[PDB]
Design a protein around this nucleic acid. Structure first.
Lengths: 60, 306, 225, 115
RNA sequence: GGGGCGUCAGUAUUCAAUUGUCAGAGGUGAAAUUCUUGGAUUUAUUGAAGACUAACAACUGCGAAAGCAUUCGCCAAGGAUGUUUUCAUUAAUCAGGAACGUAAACUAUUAGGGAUCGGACGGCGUUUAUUUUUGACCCGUUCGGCACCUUACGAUAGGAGUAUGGU
């Protein structure tokens, strides 16, 4: 009654994307700890980029 | 509200009596050309009107009304857990019923009153003392309907159960319906229940206790007659008919004693199988189910060694 | 499965989709695509014409699938509707908002934002409010982590912002205003004129609310359409 | 294809799948979780939203719009400002039983200063 | 983001209206009270009321404390800096006195350094800058202050068990 089954199997017409901004110390930590997050998000199927110039994470 | 004539031997059905009454929705209708009409209410305006008067009874909505066969007392039910009894002619109040736990939904007069309430209980009250004479449990929701016999009680748990108050214990339960159950009729002469759901199903039940009582009584008649004929057969020695009857009536002790004597009659037929050609004939003309039950008894008597 | 209602409440249900009916929407001039969708509404008859209902309603659509450009995935717009034809529903501008996700995306610590709200009257007697938001620039080749501006600089920057927005919104009409709002010229000119007092990281117009419309000029409306 | 906008009001207590036209005024169909599950404790279940989204998607494809813009919200005044398991499992069941998804937006009412 | 007065907005909450509504909604560990075909909750658009000013928001800023964060306008005050500005003890301290006003619950230097904000001076240069202004970024000098760490320069400030006998 409460259990969530894992989704077994194009459900997106408009390529959706979200963004967030962060400061510099977070940029340092996020840059040397990013590849874990992008491996897991690629496993789920979501392209994630980090921008150390502007300081912005984007998922799409 | 309105009042209609039915004409059975014509296609005429008119609404020739009408009543405006009060401003909310009329709740229930009670009838003792007819005498008069007593109308309930969604508000607290109970009214009484004749055919070619107001009162305030409860606080919440009122639910159900009923008239005696003679038309002298009058009870009203409401969701503020009170039953209000009063006189049908004047404006007086003959008393007040003290309380049913959650809120009374239906009332009934006994051809002594009955109350089916919001909680999973149902009470039988009296006029003389205004005390609940009997109480009953067993439902799973509201009850919404109590109907006398010649009582049965619905629930909102798709279950209608009939019993009798003088005993006080549940007699029979009926579960034809889907989700809900609202009402119940009864033939004025015999016992016919009409249970309708909030689903579209309406089932009709008839009494069967008398029919199964006569059937079981006739079974008792033939049982004692055939048992005495078996005892006569044993005492006479007509082993063939005794075996036939014991196989029809199923008691294996007497069956086994008869079989022991027919195995040892002390004077056997030479070309018989078990000693008597009659017993060979019945064992030949055995039907299949009798062969099977004989195989069961034979398994047991073979388990023993004597 | 089992019902729970009170006694006598569930009436007879009626199919509404008999008297429900469709209407193609049409967008105004300066957007790239005119067909924006369809509107289901009650059927017209006496006793409250669907003409009155459709004059009542408003719509909200996104600039992404208006301009066919995923760059304007934010900056959603709101369209009133005043006209109706046979199976067609002409629309007119009403408002412009962002996404709350976009605002949360834009806020950042150790840099300050300045807001400004102006009440401008365009040529067509439309009173409207423009709320613009501007985030402070972090200058390349700096070591100091906090890019804070003094309150005098912030008030002067908001004063310049009010001046620029009013000067470039009180000279033109509403169609010219939204033809300005689509490619974001106003934030560009704000940045260009305010970078001398303090550089701004980005200047957006986060809200545009039309308050009062005083006219019903179907000539101008069909001129747009 | 016709886009219809579905407001998923997903509280911690109940779930509301609501389908309207692009105006937001003309309600096509709504199905909650409490009207599909008997237990008030289980009223906010991912199972409740799964049944609700199946019913809603069946209705809106029987109408034949097959494309939804999704707006998710939560109790935003003094509540939690975060959606529910209703929201997540409802979106999953929807785009599993059809329903080409267009624009997703988490439109919750966020107060500037509440109390 | 010192105070006072007015003014401007932003949402949200509550209330109300209109429209689409069609069986629950609301809690809670679970319930219930309650509101609910005269249509709740919900969806969309408005209007009114009262409140507060999210994110920005800090090992920051301000005021003597308590305290102070929407925009703008007015009113006075206040701090720091600079001066090629004055009077020259007017000073410091506090008896007495005067103005401001549900809680608690783990606790003459230190000798520099790196931050920080407010002035002021400077100047290799990037950017405003269509080129002078000017402002932003960098760095150096000099006052002032909110705090960090390091250094001290030092200092100094009955309880629990077990018995016995009475009341």
């Amino acid at each position: 009654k409460w259990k969530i089954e894992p989704f077994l199997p194009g459900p997106f017409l408009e390529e959706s994307s979200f963004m967030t901004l962060f400061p510099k110390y977070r940029e340092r930590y996020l840059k040397d700890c990013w590849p874990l997050v992008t491996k897991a998000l690629e496993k789920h199927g979501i392209a994630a980029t980090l921008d150390i110039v502007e300081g912005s994470m984007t998922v799409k | 509200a309105r009042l209609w004539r039915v004409d059975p031997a014509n296609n005429s059905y008119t609404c020739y009596a009408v009543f405006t009454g009060h401003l909310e929705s009329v709740g229930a209708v009670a009838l003792p050309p007819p005498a008069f009409l007593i109308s309930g209410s969604q508000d607290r305006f109970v009214q009484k009107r004749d055919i070619p008067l107001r009162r305030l009874a409860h606080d919440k909505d009122i639910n159900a009304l009923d008239i005696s066969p003679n038309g002298k007392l009058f009870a009203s039910a409401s969701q503020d857990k009170t039953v209000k009894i009063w006189d049908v002619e004047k404006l007086e109040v003959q008393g007040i019923l003290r309380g049913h736990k959650r809120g009374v939904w239906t009332v009934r007069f006994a051809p002594v009153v009955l109350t089916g309430s919001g909680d999973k209980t149902i009470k039988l009250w009296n006029l003389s003392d205004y005390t609940c004479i009997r109480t009953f449990e067993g439902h799973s929701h509201n009850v919404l309907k109590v109907v006398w016999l010649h009582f049965a009680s619905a629930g909102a748990d798709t279950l209608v159960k009939v019993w009798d108050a003088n005993t006080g214990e549940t007699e029979c339960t009926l579960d034809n319906h889907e989700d809900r159950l609202w009402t119940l009729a009864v033939h004025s002469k015999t016992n016919i229940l009409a249970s309708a759901g909030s689903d579209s199903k309406v089932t009709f039940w008839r009494d069967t206790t008398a029919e199964t009582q006569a059937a079981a009584a006739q079974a008792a008649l033939k049982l004692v007659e055939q048992e005495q004929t078996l005892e006569n057969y044993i005492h006479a020695g007509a082993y063939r008919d005794a075996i036939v009857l014991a196989l029809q009536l199923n008691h294996p002790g007497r069956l086994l004693n008869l079989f022991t004597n027919v195995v040892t009659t002390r004077n056997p037929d030479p070309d018989s199988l078990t000693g008597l050609k009659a017993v060979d004939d019945v064992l030949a003309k055995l039907s299949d189910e009798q062969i099977f039950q004989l195989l069961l008894r034979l398994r047991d008597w073979n388990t023993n060694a004597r | 499965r089992l019902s729970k209602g009170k006694k006598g409440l569930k009436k007879k249900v009626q199919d509404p989709f008999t008297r429900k009916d469709w209407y193609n929407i049409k967008a105004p001039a300066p957007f790239a695509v005119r067909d924006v969708g369809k509107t289901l509404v009650n059927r017209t008859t006496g006793l409250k014409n669907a003409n009155d209902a459709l004059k009542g309603r408003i719509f909200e659509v996104c600039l992404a699938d208006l301009q066919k450009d995923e760059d304007h995935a934010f900056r959603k717009i709101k369209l009133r509707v005043d006209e109706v034809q046979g199976k067609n529903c002409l629309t007119n501008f009403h408002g412009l908002d962002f996404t709350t996700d976009k605002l949360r995306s834009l806020v950042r610590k150790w840099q300050t934002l300045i807001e400004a709200n102006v009440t401008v009257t365009t040529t067509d007697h439309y009173l409207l409010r423009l709320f613009a938001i501007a985030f402070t620039k972090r200058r390349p080749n700096q070591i100091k982590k906090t890019t804070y501006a003094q309150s005098s600089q912030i008030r002067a920057i908001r004063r310049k912002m009010v001046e620029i927005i009013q000067r470039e919104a009180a000279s033109c009409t509403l169609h010219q205003l939204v033809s300005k709002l689509i490619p974001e010229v106003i934030g560009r000119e704000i940045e260009k004129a305010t970078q001398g007092i303090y550089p701004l990281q980005n200047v957006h117009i986060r809200k545009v609310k039309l308050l009062k419309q005083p006219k019903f000029d179907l000539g101008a409306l069909m001129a747009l359409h | 294809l016709v886009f219809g906008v579905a407001r998923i009001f997903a509280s911690f207590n109940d779930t509301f799948v609501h389908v309207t036209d692009l105006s937001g005024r003309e309600t096509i169909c709504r199905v909650t979780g409490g009207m599909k599950v008997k237990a008030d404790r289980d009223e906010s279940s991912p199972y409740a939203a799964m049944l609700a989204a199946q019913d809603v998607a069946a209705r809106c494809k029987e109408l034949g719009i097959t494309a939804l813009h999704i707006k998710i919200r939560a109790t935003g005044g003094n509540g939690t400002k975060t959606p529910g398991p209703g929201a997540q499992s409802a979106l999953r069941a929807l785009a599993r039983s059809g329903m080409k998804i267009g624009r997703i937006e988490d439109v919750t009412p966020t107060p500037s200063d509440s109390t």
